[PDB]
Point group: D2
């Protein structure tokens, strides 16, 4: 049984002896083909999302729990967590045949609670926050003799995580460098100590989120230190203080460290989905984000580089924020302020020039009696090249257009704010419409709507798929009368 | 070699003889634990996204291509597709050692083109649309002797898809019913003919998208018929006419058919991600959406039910639309019209009552000199129960609140339209702000901003994670002066 | 639950549903490369010796036992067997978690008893013979409620054995014919009924030992019949009466039957060891022996032919008889009666002509004062061709030699009988010798022994490896005085 | 590329990088249940007979050949061998896509030649012996540029063999000691250097055949030395001189060495067959024979001990010698000199007392007119206990019996020599007989034969199975007249 501050050879022995395959499985090491071509390196991903709990954490939990005494196992284990560690402990306890109590705050989402219960753990809801949940777990440990299972700061947890690197070196014995995400440091400590026993020429690089960089803080100070604040986007690495034993190993065996911001994590999440069709949680894509930054910083080319996709436990709706952040750094649409006359038919005449393109925004509220201003978005497939062709076509067609595609406020805020109330109150009626979405679908809708009615409001927000949905007001194809809709009355009526 | 209209026993023999495991692999059959508990059935998912091309289509393509003569193989194969069939053909041709030409429209996204090239196919860009690409492929087939590889309407393609059902019946020999998505019918034809040879008591149910229901149309008419229109949300099943041979088999061996709308497909995509952490493309989640509708329609309980996750090739950014549609049928936020005085400090005083909750929207534009109206969104974790508690707390605090949470126009349109131009022009300056996102973060920002300045515009749209980003205008923490921003000038300035 | 006389489609369903992989495993189907080349067919072996009990029998036992009711399982199972069925039942009961009592005669070898105990069965030693063991098992079944597990005559046992054919047809879906050994008929019934449901064009041929041919007897009579006698060489098929339900299926679904003698089984055992390095028990090589006979009888060429290596439970010492029988049909040695003078040095002079060959026999006892007769064996590597060269060389050297290589009595008996007592009593002393075995080793020993002593007895029996061991008597290199050895006194002394 | 005399860390790196799984496979590590119980240790066998060439040798050959330059690979490889190394080289060259020439003596058995050709090597028959074959291979290496592939003395061959130990330590990370057979030392060098890098507390023990102990000789001298002679029973370890580089590693990293004789190897071969139903060639069972000797020498108990079953390439007929040697150290039969009167019926009356036992020998030739002496063998199942019961029963029945069961000359020689010529010439006729073999079968034959005829010769040699075969002569049930058989005339006639 490993205790205290083991030597490197002792950690190697414990990694080899850790019975993790009673619960965990050997996960694939896959080449990222598109990113490898773009970045001129062989980039490999270690797919720990393929574990039954969708993260690496069952490795360390099983290794530590399997190493307990028979009396400790008879008295049960306990931890405090609503996340990946809780699932790892619950699953391991089902595989070992040991009682596991997991304490989580009372406000924990039911889906997280049932996930842990489904893996085999007994759950106790207690506490206004994580700190109160952990205090209760520790008190129950004292009163009832449960053994606390730590998320990272324990030699047997570290040895368990080290089994991932023992697989890695046998799946590609020609690796040059390995990138590892760092929360409390158990994964990085285990990977680094094992690699440096077997193939010490391999470089091991820690990656932290810049707003949750407790390892970097500790390295700068020479010892663990508390972060005042921790960003919450990447939950798995949202750790304020590095572990004592994980720090000892990371300080000794890591070769480098790099930090990245949340938008870089977002772009790495999209990379992983496009290349290997894997969803990574933000902490699971952190190591790739660091690798990409490191490749550019050091002009790395021609090497074999691996990162750990450490987990996939992210809520489906969380991917909307990630995609919205990725779009800001991409060129998927043109954003235009188009000034056209307030004459009936002008909207149709403009859209006729857009032709068979996918319109993503077409937003307007009456203001000036002479000229309407429309916020127009157009899907692009060829980026700036295509944006310029649309601008040139609109100019050759005699339209006054201001390009807003690089306007940060348009991209971040104003695209969600076009509309509001008219300059003076209008006698208008309000209608919603729906049509199948295809290139030219808005054009054909406007052609059908015609010129008889003066439009005083228009909202159309489309991702380019499925159905287009229009809100329009007219002064005095599914279609529904929305006149005097309460939301209109409070925020759009004059 | 199967030709024409084979008997059921001949299809069974061809399924057993199809050498698909030279390219495809046996995919897992997994229990959906959460959905099984909610719907009181054992619900199983066949994970064809685990194929190397992330769909089932390599099965039929390899079986057909492996069955060609040596001279046909020497002259190469050809198809027209930018999607899952193209990848299946390209991958099979690399495994068989045969030249494959794939013709795709010239406007095909580069990522789709490189995916096919990466699987081993030669790509020819030709045509303004799919029909022109297919005409060129057929002409090249005539001129140069390439053998056309059809996406569904061929007995050896059908037999190849049938290998999926041969695995299925050995992975759970106690299944009650199997649900299958239908595009052109090759998958359903192969699954149904095989199941009815081996275990005919199993029910096989076709699932179509209601806006792409060519099998249902053909069943109603008694023969294949052209759909006038096909919805494009579910690309893999966007087929206007059922196959001749697939129709013969589906008419004879299917037990039922059901259709579903796009929002049901969206909800099934979220189900699959939450239960087995798999991303399905819309066609890949179609069968589950049908199964859920069928369970309710027929009060099915206590049965073992399987569906095919047929593919995972959906663009990452496409998940934003899916999530936005899912949210409309859920209770994740309260939407409020809050009327508060136009006195400095009123925004802070209201937010102080909201306390440590996650605000998702806080949007305002000056209108009336006496009362401001704010569009407020609040994240919920306990649904309508929690919504009512917030309403009651706001009422007990003396605020005039209109609940907009069930207002379809607020949910679909007005939440993207609050702002616009003031009732008269104002002397104002515009600033953007950013702060780390956490419960109470907007409150602490407003507390810091203080009461010195009269706010005339406020926009704050948050998913509740990472960083909060505010746009505010003031009449005469990262912070940037945005005064006279062009997007503001055209759409927000008075 | 299958009962009575199920239809073919019901057996197919039960084969698919039999949960055999909780105990048994998918076994390899291997090409026999050397035999395929010699016999001009693709000959494949299904390796049921790779099951944990080294025979197929765990398939049927697990399928039947898993299908019992909860009350039957609670009361336990029982059978009577000291062989492969006992092991199958014991192993299945350990996997199912059910009590299994196995009754075996009291004289059962300890190694068979401990094998069954080691697989997880409780063993009761009872009875002077198998019939008394079975009567006790049946009585215990009545008194204590154990469910009898039959070795073959039960629909669920048959369905269990059928899983082997379900694997077979997926491992080579292009098979032409399958050969199956028949004891009581459970294996053949299961294989035939399954194959004829899935690929009825495949021919299924039963193979019986000619001295244990109860299926052939039953087919000739039209119903099960008792054999008066059963040969005991092939224990697994030593069955006097075909099963009732196995007969029904074999009569309906088999295409042919063939019988073979024990020497053919012996040759098939050697074939299997030489080609795939597998040891088959006699019943496990029976199907191959039938296939070889069938190929020649019907001039089969160019086909894909499979047989079942049904078991490997044969005692190591049993392989000596098998090898000795194989040698009689081979040309591995020349056997000679060499008449040489009774002059000191004649043995050495003859061996000097043999040179560097491996002598297998060199046996002599004084008889005639003028001419000695030696029984000489010589290892051959080139068969009759080499035999003739040795005869020609001996004749050119002036020796009188009678070729005994084709003498059946020399091969079967007299090679174990050369020696005995001299024509009159001699004053002799007896010595044993040992030397390292190599070509020419006997020659070098005789050269060292020299001509000083008159040899009156010589025995040397060598397999051509390791050490040569000589017994010699002389009238008045390890070496031991054996004079007045008791065995010499009773059987060799004059 | 490893060259010269690498450090331990360099060998570890090369073991991890050796691409052996392009040809070799991970082989099982199995507990020997019966031997573990008898010897009070956990005894595990590493099953290298499961490689496609039925020995470990493809590991080292593939690792060395895969590491050659492109030009070396283009010019081909060569070796000289008719055994396991030849197969390893031939198979590797087929997997690598490289020409391999294997030179073997012209007298090599066709089955060995075709085995190598079947694995993919080109074979050249050249030379009167192995030394001439090797000289030709070396000359062809010089003239045509083939790269010589050595059987053991090369760092990349050693690293390849080391992959076996890398599997071993992951299959049981709690091993105490590992036993390894030693021919030229490549296996032991690779196993020892790897184990001592990863888990140096594990003891590694070399096992040599006492008559082929070139490592022990080299250890005693301090450097490689030539053995004058090498025993040929264990072909794979029949090496006269240890390798230079293998010696360096074995001297540094081995913990002990032990030697065993051929009979111990024989007993280990039987152990392996009885426990795991594996056939080992003599070199493949050598390590187990050493382990058994080591356990007794050092009173080892309670440990986890592994040995390498290094190969299974032994000819089927070679197992007869192994079984015959094992029988000498066992108690499977009683051997008796029974003196009975020369009165018609005496043979029948004696056998009637033997009853239903299995007679293995019943041999007689007329000598004294008053008393016949019979050589009688009886199968035992309860060893000395049962032998004594038979002796006591025969004595109580009034027979004069001399126990020959412990007589080494009876067991080794005289059992093959009872018969010969009568004291004076007799008028006799000779007949052969055959009957089904079962307990009491000889008794029933003698009862049928009756008392009418005076028997002057009787030979009956049975292994107790299948058919009993009698030769008998009578003075003046299949049955054939053998009178004046030539073998009788030369060796049995008076």
């Amino acid at each position: 049984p490993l205790s205290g501050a083991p030597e490197g050879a002792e950690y190697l022995r414990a990694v080899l002896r850790a019975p993790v395959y009673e619960a965990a499985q050997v996960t694939p090491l896959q080449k990222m083909e598109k990113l490898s071509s773009r970045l001129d390196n062989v980039i490999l991903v270690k797919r720990e999302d393929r574990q039954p709990v969708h993260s690496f954490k069952l490795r360390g939990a099983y290794a530590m729990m399997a190493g307990l005494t028979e009396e400790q196992k008879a008295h049960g284990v306990i931890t405090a967590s609503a996340g990946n560690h809780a699932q790892g402990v619950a699953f391991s306890s089902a595989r070992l045949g040991v009682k596991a109590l997991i304490v989580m705050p009372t406000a924990t989402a039911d889906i997280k609670v049932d996930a842990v219960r489904g893996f085999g753990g007994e759950v106790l809801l207690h506490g206004a926050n994580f700190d109160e949940a952990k205090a209760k777990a520790i008190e129950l440990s004292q009163q009832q003799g449960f053994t606390w299972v730590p998320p990272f700061d324990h030699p047997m947890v570290i040895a368990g995580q080290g089994t991932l690197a023992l697989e890695l070196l046998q799946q590609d014995a020609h690796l040059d460098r390995v990138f590892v995400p760092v929360g409390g440091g158990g994964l990085a400590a285990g990977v680094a100590v094992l690699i440096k026993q077997l193939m010490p020429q391999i470089k091991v690089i820690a990656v932290e989120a810049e707003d949750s960089a407790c390892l970097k803080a500790a390295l700068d100070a020479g010892h663990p230190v508390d972060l005042p604040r921790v960003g919450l986007f990447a939950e798995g690495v949202a750790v304020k203080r590095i572990g004592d034993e994980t720090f000892r190993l990371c300080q000794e065996y890591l070769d480098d460290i790099i930090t990245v911001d949340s938008d870089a994590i977002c772009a790495a999440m999209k990379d992983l989905f496009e290349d290997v069709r894997a969803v990574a949680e933000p902490s699971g894509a952190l190591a790739l984000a660091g690798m990409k930054k490191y490749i550019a910083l050091h002009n790395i080319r021609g090497e074999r580089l691996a990162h750990i996709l450490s987990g996939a436990n992210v809520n489906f709706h969380g991917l909307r924020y990630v995609s919205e952040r990725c779009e800001l750094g991409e060129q998927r649409e043109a954003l235009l302020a188009v000034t056209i006359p307030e004459e009936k038919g002008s909207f149709l005449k403009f859209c006729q020039l857009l032709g068979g393109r996918s319109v993503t925004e077409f937003n307007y509220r009456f203001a000036d009696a002479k000229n309407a201003c429309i916020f127009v978005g157009v899907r692009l497939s060829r980026g700036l090249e295509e944006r310029k062709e649309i601008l040139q076509m609109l100019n050759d067609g005699g339209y006054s257009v201001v390009d807003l595609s690089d306007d940060e406020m348009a991209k971040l805020h104003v695209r969600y704010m076009v509309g509001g109330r008219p300059s003076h109150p209008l006698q208008e009626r309000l209608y919603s419409f729906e049509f199948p979405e295809s290139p030219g679908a808005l054009l054909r809708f406007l052609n059908t709507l015609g010129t008889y009615w003066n439009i005083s409001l228009f909202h159309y927000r489309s991702h380019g798929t499925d159905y287009g949905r229009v809100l329009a007001a007219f002064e005095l194809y599914d279609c529904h009368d929305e006149t005097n809709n309460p939301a209109f009355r409070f925020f759009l009526a004059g």
